[PDB]
């Protein structure tokens, strides 16, 4: 005989440890990671000089 094997929703919420959650509801909005920025400041005034 054959049987189905349940729901692995809570089984895979166990499997997703160590994996950073992002927010995919309306737009694929991540809130993790970084980026490198070169910052050129030749054209900054001082606002008080």
């Amino acid at each position: 005989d054959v049987v189905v094997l349940g729901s692995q929703e809570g089984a895979m919420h166990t499997a997703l440890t160590g994996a950073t959650e992002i927010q995919m509801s309306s737009g694929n909005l991540l809130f993790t990671g970084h980026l490198k920025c070169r910052l050129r400041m030749d054209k900054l005034q001082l606002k008080g000089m």
């Binding site: 499997a15 997703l16 440890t17 160590g18 950073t20 959650e21 993790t32 970084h34």
Partner: protein, 72 residues
Amino acid sequence: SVALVPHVGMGLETRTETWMSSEGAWKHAQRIETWILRHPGFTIMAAILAYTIGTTHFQRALIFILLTAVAP
């Protein structure tokens, strides 16, 4: 099942917290601890077989903790 391979050593870890940091960092040690407290005699036998092999203390302790950590 799919509840194994728990996505632990994969790189990708940023400054942000993961899905179960502080609830998955110690579940392995708690599971092994309650396993030993429910199954002592395999740890006694693991001490006996760990002692007879390993002609120095370091690999006796090493084979003991590995033989403990293999069995669930």
